[PDB]
Design a protein around this ligand. Structure first.
Ligand SMILES: CC(C)C[C@H](NP(=O)(O)CNC(=O)OCc1ccccc1)C(=O)N[C@@H](Cc1ccccc1)C(=O)O
Ligand SMILES: [Ca+2]
Ligand SMILES: [Ca+2]
Ligand SMILES: [Ca+2]
Ligand SMILES: [Ca+2]
Ligand SMILES: [Zn+2]
Length: 316
């Protein structure tokens, strides 16, 4: 909408106060004009019609319980935009400052979040398995990264290409979580998963097997559930990424860590210059090796570590 840029204040899902960029025209709307062609947050009103209504508030104060998921979807979309722009020189998900749209309060007791081809969508959770999913910065960045993937490599959402698609979202979800630097870790969804259980998460990149996901290609799932295991086999790639950044010895194979920034550079270049819609795990290894070669040189530690990491997870 047309209006003047303003700054509201509110509380997110975890009870933390933050400022949010809004737009004033009669009401104050969750429309952030400071980033690209805007970030827009919508109320789905417990229904499944999308996007719903652009979020309107009378006083620019967002402290109601019902406001919290909107505050966080809006704010964390901003953080994710900033990560891509500042770290990778990428302007929104399409590289040309496309408007970023999110809807919250999707359906009733809905324990998921997704990119629907055009926008991000967040359930509120059922209060047992999840609380509102936009409360997780890794979750928000995971969803926006699906849009980045779709506009770039275009990895098909099934089998190995789909597991790479998923791992790319977990990797950049995690790198955004580190960028914001509030309780960062290599776990996925811990801030919004199982409020009654401390210390768990949906997936782990550092030890995928903790939650039943494979950490070696020999353990890959090849059945039909979950689009051929896209959220399962992602563990193999997540583990490789974790090893590249942090190092370790896995099934006797030692990897020298090169840190998060270089992990992000290598995978961003692979995603945007080498991967294609049908890339498999072996092709990802080749893309990452080539990306590290471009950035750091064929004789570099970075190239050596990428090879070690894929060796460690059984991908040649
Ligand atoms: C980061 C977490 C919180 C959300 C994440 N969601 P996501 O990977 O974006 C869901 N993907 C998805 O819905 O793809 C199907 C689709 C394709 C095209 C258009 C619209 C939808 C996830 O890992 N979902 C998993 C795990 C999960 C979470 C919550 C409930 C059930 C399962 C899944 O869907 O399997
Ligand atoms: Ca208000
Ligand atoms: Ca965390
Ligand atoms: Ca996390
Ligand atoms: Ca928990
Ligand atoms: Zn995903």
């Amino acid at each position: 909408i047309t209006g003047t840029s303003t700054v509201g204040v509110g509380r997110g899902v975890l009870g933390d106060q933050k400022n949010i960029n809004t737009t004033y025209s009669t009401y104050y709307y969750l429309q952030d004009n400071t980033r690209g062609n805007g970030i827009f947050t919508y109320d789905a009103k417990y229904r499944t019609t999308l996007p719903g209504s652009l979020w309107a508030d009378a006083d620019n104060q967002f402290f109601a319980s019902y406001d919290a998921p909107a505050v966080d979807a809006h704010y964390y979309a901003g953080v994710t935009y900033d990560y891509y722009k500042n770290v990778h020189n990428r302007l929104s998900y399409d590289g040309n400052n496309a408007a970023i749209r999110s809807s919250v309060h999707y359906s009733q007791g809905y324990n998921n979040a997704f990119w629907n081809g055009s926008q991000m969508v967040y359930g509120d959770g059922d209060g047992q398995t999840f609380i509102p999913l936009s409360g997780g910065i890794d979750v928000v960045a995971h969803e926006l990264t699906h849009a980045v993937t779709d506009y770039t490599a275009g990895l098909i959402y099934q089998n190995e290409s789909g597991a790479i698609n998923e791992a790319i979202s977990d990797i950049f979800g995690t790198l955004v979580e580190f960028y914001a630097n509030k309780n960062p870790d290599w776990e996925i969804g811990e801030d919004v998963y199982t409020p009654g259980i401390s210390g768990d998460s949906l997936r782990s990149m550092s030890d995928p097997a903790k939650y039943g996901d494979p950490d070696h290609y020999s353990k890959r799932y090849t059945g039909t559930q979950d689009n051929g295991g896209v959220h399962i086999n992602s563990g193999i790639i997540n583990k490789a990424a974790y090893l590249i950044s942090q190092g370790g010895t896995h099934y006797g194979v030692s990897v020298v860590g090169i840190g998060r920034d270089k992990l992000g550079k290598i995978f961003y270049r692979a995603l945007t210059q080498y991967l294609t819609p049908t890339s498999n795990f072996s092709q990802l290894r080749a893309a990452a090796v080539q990306s590290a070669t471009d950035l750091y040189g064929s004789t570099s530690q970075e190239v050596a570590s990428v090879k070690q990491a894929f060796d460690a997870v059984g991908v040649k």
